[PDB]
PDB file of C-alpha atoms in Angstrom:
ATOM      1  CA  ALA N   3     -17.282   3.441   6.693  1.00 30.65           C
ATOM      2  CA  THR N   4     -16.215   4.357   3.192  1.00 28.20           C
ATOM      3  CA  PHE N   5     -14.192   1.985   1.053  1.00 28.75           C
ATOM      4  CA  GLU N   6     -12.708   3.191  -2.224  1.00 29.74           C
ATOM      5  CA  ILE N   7     -12.150   0.114  -4.458  1.00 29.78           C
ATOM      6  CA  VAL N   8      -9.613   0.856  -7.166  1.00 31.90           C
ATOM      7  CA  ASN N   9      -8.690  -1.344 -10.083  1.00 26.40           C
ATOM      8  CA  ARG N  10      -5.033  -0.751 -11.006  1.00 26.73           C
ATOM      9  CA  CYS N  11      -4.953  -4.008 -13.075  1.00 26.01           C
ATOM     10  CA  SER N  12      -4.448  -3.682 -16.822  1.00 26.56           C
ATOM     11  CA  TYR N  13      -7.610  -5.855 -17.145  1.00 23.79           C
ATOM     12  CA  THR N  14     -11.242  -5.334 -16.132  1.00 22.61           C
ATOM     13  CA  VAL N  15     -12.292  -6.833 -12.817  1.00 18.95           C
ATOM     14  CA  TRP N  16     -15.734  -7.104 -11.285  1.00 17.67           C
ATOM     15  CA  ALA N  17     -15.422  -5.925  -7.688  1.00 19.84           C
ATOM     16  CA  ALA N  18     -17.559  -7.703  -5.099  1.00 19.81           C
ATOM     17  CA  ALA N  19     -18.456  -6.731  -1.538  1.00 21.43           C
ATOM     18  CA  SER N  20     -20.434  -8.961   0.855  1.00 19.64           C
ATOM     19  CA  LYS N  21     -20.853 -10.018   4.482  1.00 17.49           C
ATOM     20  CA  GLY N  22     -21.877 -13.572   3.471  1.00 15.62           C
ATOM     21  CA  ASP N  23     -25.645 -13.348   3.957  1.00 15.52           C
ATOM     22  CA  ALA N  24     -26.019  -9.917   2.292  1.00 17.41           C
ATOM     23  CA  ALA N  25     -24.460  -7.472  -0.152  1.00 16.67           C
ATOM     24  CA  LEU N  26     -22.323  -4.570   1.143  1.00 16.54           C
ATOM     25  CA  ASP N  27     -23.640  -1.415  -0.631  1.00 15.06           C
ATOM     26  CA  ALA N  28     -24.540  -2.474  -4.240  1.00 15.84           C
ATOM     27  CA  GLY N  29     -22.577  -5.730  -3.757  1.00 17.51           C
ATOM     28  CA  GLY N  30     -20.719  -5.632  -7.070  1.00 17.08           C
ATOM     29  CA  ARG N  31     -19.705  -3.568 -10.063  1.00 16.97           C
ATOM     30  CA  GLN N  32     -17.572  -3.666 -13.168  1.00 14.75           C
ATOM     31  CA  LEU N  33     -14.249  -1.820 -12.775  1.00 11.81           C
ATOM     32  CA  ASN N  34     -12.333  -1.210 -15.952  1.00 11.94           C
ATOM     33  CA  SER N  35      -8.574  -0.582 -15.651  1.00 12.26           C
ATOM     34  CA  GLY N  36      -8.052   2.542 -13.516  1.00  8.15           C
ATOM     35  CA  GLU N  37     -11.694   2.843 -12.344  1.00  6.32           C
ATOM     36  CA  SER N  38     -12.569   3.585  -8.701  1.00  4.09           C
ATOM     37  CA  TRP N  39     -15.794   2.573  -6.981  1.00  3.95           C
ATOM     38  CA  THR N  40     -16.677   4.194  -3.619  1.00  7.00           C
ATOM     39  CA  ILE N  41     -18.920   2.189  -1.327  1.00  7.54           C
ATOM     40  CA  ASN N  42     -20.451   2.767   2.062  1.00  8.45           C
ATOM     41  CA  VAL N  43     -20.245  -0.119   4.516  1.00  8.16           C
ATOM     42  CA  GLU N  44     -22.532  -0.012   7.567  1.00  9.17           C
ATOM     43  CA  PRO N  45     -20.631   0.617  10.854  1.00  9.24           C
ATOM     44  CA  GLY N  46     -20.408  -2.535  12.975  1.00  8.70           C
ATOM     45  CA  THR N  47     -20.175  -4.809   9.869  1.00  5.09           C
ATOM     46  CA  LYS N  48     -18.608  -8.060  11.099  1.00  2.56           C
ATOM     47  CA  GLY N  49     -16.921 -10.413   8.640  1.00  5.21           C
ATOM     48  CA  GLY N  50     -17.144  -8.246   5.524  1.00  7.49           C
ATOM     49  CA  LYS N  51     -15.132  -9.201   2.453  1.00  6.88           C
ATOM     50  CA  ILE N  52     -14.119  -7.413  -0.743  1.00  4.72           C
ATOM     51  CA  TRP N  53     -12.663  -9.308  -3.692  1.00  5.68           C
ATOM     52  CA  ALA N  54     -12.147  -9.057  -7.448  1.00  7.99           C
ATOM     53  CA  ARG N  55     -13.759 -11.374  -9.968  1.00  7.60           C
ATOM     54  CA  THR N  56     -12.131 -12.010 -13.351  1.00  6.68           C
ATOM     55  CA  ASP N  57     -13.416 -12.856 -16.883  1.00  9.30           C
ATOM     56  CA  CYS N  58     -17.099 -12.193 -16.117  1.00 10.61           C
ATOM     57  CA  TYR N  59     -20.095 -12.169 -18.414  1.00 11.14           C
ATOM     58  CA  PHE N  60     -23.408 -10.628 -17.289  1.00 13.32           C
ATOM     59  CA  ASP N  61     -26.652 -10.129 -19.164  1.00 14.06           C
ATOM     60  CA  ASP N  62     -28.897  -6.986 -19.020  1.00 13.46           C
ATOM     61  CA  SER N  63     -30.474  -8.330 -15.721  1.00 12.99           C
ATOM     62  CA  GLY N  64     -27.085  -8.756 -13.968  1.00 15.80           C
ATOM     63  CA  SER N  65     -26.998 -12.590 -14.195  1.00 14.52           C
ATOM     64  CA  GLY N  66     -23.983 -14.423 -15.522  1.00 11.96           C
ATOM     65  CA  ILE N  67     -20.733 -16.108 -14.562  1.00  9.80           C
ATOM     66  CA  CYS N  68     -17.137 -15.250 -13.486  1.00  7.29           C
ATOM     67  CA  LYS N  69     -14.067 -17.445 -13.981  1.00  3.26           C
ATOM     68  CA  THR N  70     -12.945 -16.510 -10.469  1.00  2.00           C
ATOM     69  CA  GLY N  71     -14.893 -15.376  -7.407  1.00  2.00           C
ATOM     70  CA  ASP N  72     -18.388 -16.014  -8.846  1.00  2.00           C
ATOM     71  CA  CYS N  73     -21.100 -15.319  -6.204  1.00  2.00           C
ATOM     72  CA  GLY N  74     -23.941 -17.479  -7.597  1.00  2.00           C
ATOM     73  CA  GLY N  75     -23.825 -15.728 -10.985  1.00  2.00           C
ATOM     74  CA  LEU N  76     -24.875 -12.280  -9.803  1.00  2.00           C
ATOM     75  CA  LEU N  77     -23.223  -9.012 -10.807  1.00  2.00           C
ATOM     76  CA  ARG N  78     -24.450  -7.600  -7.447  1.00  2.00           C
ATOM     77  CA  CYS N  79     -23.052 -10.133  -4.932  1.00  2.00           C
ATOM     78  CA  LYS N  80     -25.150 -11.195  -1.938  1.00  2.00           C
ATOM     79  CA  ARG N  81     -22.927 -14.117  -0.846  1.00  2.00           C
ATOM     80  CA  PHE N  82     -19.183 -14.922  -0.805  1.00  2.00           C
ATOM     81  CA  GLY N  83     -17.389 -15.843  -4.028  1.00  2.00           C
ATOM     82  CA  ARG N  84     -16.200 -19.156  -5.382  1.00  2.00           C
ATOM     83  CA  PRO N  85     -12.417 -19.665  -4.784  1.00  2.00           C
ATOM     84  CA  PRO N  86      -9.777 -18.816  -5.846  1.00  2.00           C
ATOM     85  CA  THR N  87     -10.237 -15.288  -4.459  1.00  2.00           C
ATOM     86  CA  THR N  88      -7.753 -13.037  -2.763  1.00  2.00           C
ATOM     87  CA  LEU N  89      -9.769 -11.517   0.123  1.00  2.00           C
ATOM     88  CA  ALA N  90      -9.772  -8.088   1.828  1.00  2.00           C
ATOM     89  CA  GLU N  91     -11.481  -8.977   5.149  1.00  2.00           C
ATOM     90  CA  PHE N  92     -12.747  -6.613   7.779  1.00  2.00           C
ATOM     91  CA  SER N  93     -14.774  -6.251  10.965  1.00  2.00           C
ATOM     92  CA  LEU N  94     -15.730  -2.718  11.828  1.00  2.00           C
ATOM     93  CA  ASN N  95     -16.500  -1.077  15.196  1.00  2.00           C
ATOM     94  CA  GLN N  96     -15.667  -4.205  17.201  1.00  2.00           C
ATOM     95  CA  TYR N  97     -15.363  -2.870  20.767  1.00  2.00           C
ATOM     96  CA  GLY N  98     -14.210   0.508  19.443  1.00  5.30           C
ATOM     97  CA  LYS N  99     -11.702  -0.745  16.854  1.00  6.40           C
ATOM     98  CA  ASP N 100     -11.685  -1.906  13.217  1.00  4.48           C
ATOM     99  CA  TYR N 101      -9.848  -5.067  12.190  1.00  5.73           C
ATOM    100  CA  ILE N 102      -8.525  -5.598   8.686  1.00  9.47           C
ATOM    101  CA  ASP N 103      -6.518  -8.299   6.930  1.00 12.37           C
ATOM    102  CA  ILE N 104      -5.839  -9.890   3.569  1.00 12.84           C
ATOM    103  CA  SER N 105      -6.386 -13.629   3.331  1.00 12.13           C
ATOM    104  CA  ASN N 106      -5.184 -16.347   0.920  1.00 11.52           C
ATOM    105  CA  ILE N 107      -7.290 -18.963   2.854  1.00  8.29           C
ATOM    106  CA  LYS N 108      -9.616 -19.132  -0.197  1.00  8.08           C
ATOM    107  CA  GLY N 109      -6.661 -18.945  -2.583  1.00  6.84           C
ATOM    108  CA  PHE N 110      -5.507 -16.057  -4.746  1.00  4.99           C
ATOM    109  CA  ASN N 111      -6.686 -14.559  -8.016  1.00  7.80           C
ATOM    110  CA  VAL N 112      -5.644 -10.894  -8.091  1.00  4.63           C
ATOM    111  CA  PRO N 113      -2.916  -9.007  -6.122  1.00  4.99           C
ATOM    112  CA  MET N 114      -4.285  -6.506  -3.606  1.00  5.80           C
ATOM    113  CA  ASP N 115      -3.381  -3.727  -1.179  1.00  4.02           C
ATOM    114  CA  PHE N 116      -5.830  -2.955   1.633  1.00  3.76           C
ATOM    115  CA  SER N 117      -5.018   0.247   3.472  1.00  3.83           C
ATOM    116  CA  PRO N 118      -6.712   2.854   5.678  1.00  5.47           C
ATOM    117  CA  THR N 119      -7.227   6.274   4.051  1.00  3.11           C
ATOM    118  CA  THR N 120      -7.542   7.785   7.575  1.00  3.38           C
ATOM    119  CA  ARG N 121      -4.920   8.105  10.408  1.00  3.85           C
ATOM    120  CA  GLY N 122      -3.799   5.516  12.991  1.00  2.00           C
ATOM    121  CA  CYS N 123      -2.733   2.195  11.374  1.00  2.00           C
ATOM    122  CA  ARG N 124      -0.787   0.706   8.486  1.00  2.00           C
ATOM    123  CA  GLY N 125      -2.065  -1.160   5.424  1.00  2.00           C
ATOM    124  CA  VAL N 126      -1.527  -4.783   4.342  1.00  2.00           C
ATOM    125  CA  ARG N 127      -0.501  -5.979   0.923  1.00  2.00           C
ATOM    126  CA  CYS N 128      -0.286  -9.226  -1.035  1.00  2.00           C
ATOM    127  CA  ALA N 129       1.120  -8.098  -4.416  1.00  2.00           C
ATOM    128  CA  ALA N 130       3.395 -11.033  -5.380  1.00  2.00           C
ATOM    129  CA  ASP N 131       2.881 -13.062  -8.589  1.00  2.00           C
ATOM    130  CA  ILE N 132       1.106 -15.951  -6.845  1.00  2.00           C
ATOM    131  CA  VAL N 133      -0.736 -17.124  -9.987  1.00  2.00           C
ATOM    132  CA  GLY N 134       2.523 -17.292 -12.022  1.00  2.00           C
ATOM    133  CA  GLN N 135       4.377 -19.151  -9.221  1.00  2.00           C
ATOM    134  CA  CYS N 136       1.381 -21.380  -8.200  1.00  2.00           C
ATOM    135  CA  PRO N 137       2.299 -25.047  -7.412  1.00  2.00           C
ATOM    136  CA  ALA N 138       0.996 -27.327 -10.210  1.00  3.59           C
ATOM    137  CA  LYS N 139      -1.581 -29.048  -7.966  1.00  6.13           C
ATOM    138  CA  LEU N 140      -3.151 -25.739  -6.803  1.00  5.17           C
ATOM    139  CA  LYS N 141      -3.460 -24.129 -10.266  1.00  5.99           C
ATOM    140  CA  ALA N 142      -7.056 -23.311 -11.107  1.00  7.08           C
ATOM    141  CA  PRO N 143      -7.825 -23.892 -14.851  1.00  7.55           C
ATOM    142  CA  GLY N 144     -10.333 -21.002 -14.756  1.00  8.13           C
ATOM    143  CA  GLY N 145      -7.484 -18.785 -13.519  1.00  6.56           C
ATOM    144  CA  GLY N 146      -5.954 -18.230 -10.093  1.00  7.66           C
ATOM    145  CA  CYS N 147      -4.269 -20.327  -7.418  1.00 10.09           C
ATOM    146  CA  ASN N 148      -6.561 -22.404  -5.225  1.00  8.86           C
ATOM    147  CA  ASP N 149      -5.996 -22.947  -1.517  1.00  5.84           C
ATOM    148  CA  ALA N 150      -5.289 -26.590  -0.539  1.00  6.98           C
ATOM    149  CA  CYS N 151      -8.646 -26.965   1.299  1.00  6.57           C
ATOM    150  CA  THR N 152     -10.588 -26.224  -1.897  1.00  4.82           C
ATOM    151  CA  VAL N 153      -8.483 -28.724  -3.902  1.00  2.69           C
ATOM    152  CA  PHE N 154      -8.146 -31.594  -1.398  1.00  2.00           C
ATOM    153  CA  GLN N 155     -10.965 -31.259   1.174  1.00  3.53           C
ATOM    154  CA  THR N 156      -8.970 -32.727   4.112  1.00  2.00           C
ATOM    155  CA  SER N 157      -9.314 -31.969   7.839  1.00  2.00           C
ATOM    156  CA  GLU N 158      -5.650 -30.824   7.759  1.00  2.00           C
ATOM    157  CA  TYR N 159      -6.116 -28.219   5.034  1.00  2.00           C
ATOM    158  CA  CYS N 160      -9.595 -27.060   6.083  1.00  2.00           C
ATOM    159  CA  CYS N 161      -8.693 -26.969   9.841  1.00  2.00           C
ATOM    160  CA  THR N 162     -11.888 -28.804  10.645  1.00  2.00           C
ATOM    161  CA  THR N 163     -10.745 -29.864  14.192  1.00  2.00           C
ATOM    162  CA  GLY N 164      -9.045 -26.533  15.051  1.00  2.00           C
ATOM    163  CA  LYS N 165      -5.817 -28.617  15.370  1.00  2.00           C
ATOM    164  CA  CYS N 166      -4.085 -28.002  12.004  1.00  2.00           C
ATOM    165  CA  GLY N 167      -0.566 -26.859  11.265  1.00  2.00           C
ATOM    166  CA  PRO N 168       1.096 -25.140   8.302  1.00  2.00           C
ATOM    167  CA  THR N 169       1.565 -27.284   5.207  1.00  2.00           C
ATOM    168  CA  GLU N 170       3.717 -27.268   2.060  1.00  2.00           C
ATOM    169  CA  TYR N 171       0.781 -25.463   0.323  1.00  2.00           C
ATOM    170  CA  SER N 172       0.154 -22.854   3.086  1.00  2.00           C
ATOM    171  CA  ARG N 173       3.939 -22.201   3.215  1.00  2.00           C
ATOM    172  CA  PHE N 174       3.843 -21.392  -0.518  1.00  2.00           C
ATOM    173  CA  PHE N 175       1.273 -18.597   0.044  1.00  4.55           C
ATOM    174  CA  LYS N 176       3.166 -17.413   3.166  1.00  7.98           C
ATOM    175  CA  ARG N 177       6.505 -17.296   1.348  1.00  4.73           C
ATOM    176  CA  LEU N 178       5.085 -15.136  -1.465  1.00  7.46           C
ATOM    177  CA  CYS N 179       2.752 -13.053   0.775  1.00  9.18           C
ATOM    178  CA  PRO N 180       3.912 -13.005   4.439  1.00  9.96           C
ATOM    179  CA  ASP N 181       1.329 -10.310   5.294  1.00 10.72           C
ATOM    180  CA  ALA N 182      -1.729 -12.426   4.388  1.00 10.53           C
ATOM    181  CA  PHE N 183      -3.348 -15.401   6.211  1.00  9.48           C
ATOM    182  CA  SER N 184      -2.043 -18.594   4.533  1.00 10.82           C
ATOM    183  CA  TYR N 185      -4.174 -21.083   6.559  1.00 11.52           C
ATOM    184  CA  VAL N 186      -6.977 -20.797   9.135  1.00  7.00           C
ATOM    185  CA  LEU N 187      -4.622 -21.013  12.167  1.00  8.33           C
ATOM    186  CA  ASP N 188      -1.869 -18.852  10.748  1.00  7.38           C
ATOM    187  CA  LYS N 189      -0.195 -16.392  13.146  1.00  4.78           C
ATOM    188  CA  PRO N 190      -2.675 -13.447  12.714  1.00  2.00           C
ATOM    189  CA  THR N 191      -1.646 -10.704  10.262  1.00  2.00           C
ATOM    190  CA  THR N 192      -4.739  -8.695  11.279  1.00  2.00           C
ATOM    191  CA  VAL N 193      -4.203  -4.955  11.667  1.00  2.00           C
ATOM    192  CA  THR N 194      -6.098  -3.018  14.357  1.00  2.00           C
ATOM    193  CA  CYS N 195      -7.294   0.349  13.126  1.00  2.00           C
ATOM    194  CA  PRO N 196      -9.222   3.103  15.025  1.00  2.00           C
ATOM    195  CA  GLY N 197     -12.958   2.448  15.078  1.00  2.00           C
ATOM    196  CA  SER N 198     -14.715   4.038  12.081  1.00  2.00           C
ATOM    197  CA  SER N 199     -11.624   4.296   9.841  1.00  2.00           C
ATOM    198  CA  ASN N 200     -12.001   4.604   6.010  1.00  2.00           C
ATOM    199  CA  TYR N 201     -10.168   2.390   3.529  1.00  2.00           C
ATOM    200  CA  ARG N 202      -8.976   1.792   0.022  1.00  2.00           C
ATOM    201  CA  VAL N 203      -8.717  -1.663  -1.594  1.00  2.00           C
ATOM    202  CA  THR N 204      -6.448  -1.510  -4.638  1.00  2.00           C
ATOM    203  CA  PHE N 205      -6.298  -4.421  -7.128  1.00  3.04           C
ATOM    204  CA  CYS N 206      -2.823  -4.904  -8.762  1.00  4.01           C
ATOM    205  CA  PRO N 207      -1.217  -2.182  -6.532  1.00  3.61           C
ATOM    206  CA  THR N 208       2.238  -2.548  -8.104  1.00  3.13           C
ATOM    207  CA  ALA N 209       1.276  -3.008 -11.798  1.00  3.43           C
TER     208      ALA N 209
END
């Protein structure tokens, strides 16, 4: 599956792509404003994620730090990023279909659109100014809007027991971005696409 990752932000982002225990393609790359990075994701990839990282510094060996979405200080991500991170999530070729969604379960850092570039399904978008509107208690000093689980570490926010409901914090993300998961047990906003579709993830799709 091909994913074109486009940075429409006025600022540089460091794109990251991982399945949690491994990089997807090169795993990460710098994307200046307007740059596009095309990656190949292995068919059948289950639980893949693409995100942007902001205010990064990397040395000549690709080791450094990011203010948001840092994946153990690597330019080429092998693991998931440190919240807050808006997430493009996908599972490909799952019983003949692809499943995509955007999630705010790990908070929000950059607005995103995640759409197929092939026929048969619609895209999803979370392009609202979540950082600007972020409740005081969820604001991340390093930038972004944390999810409540990251901030408070409670069974209710983290849905530890599988018996959690929406909260004042999850309702904030849902109000701004109805098309993204706002908590683990949120009514699924997952889109079913034909198996082997191709996609584009666009950071800052509106601005």
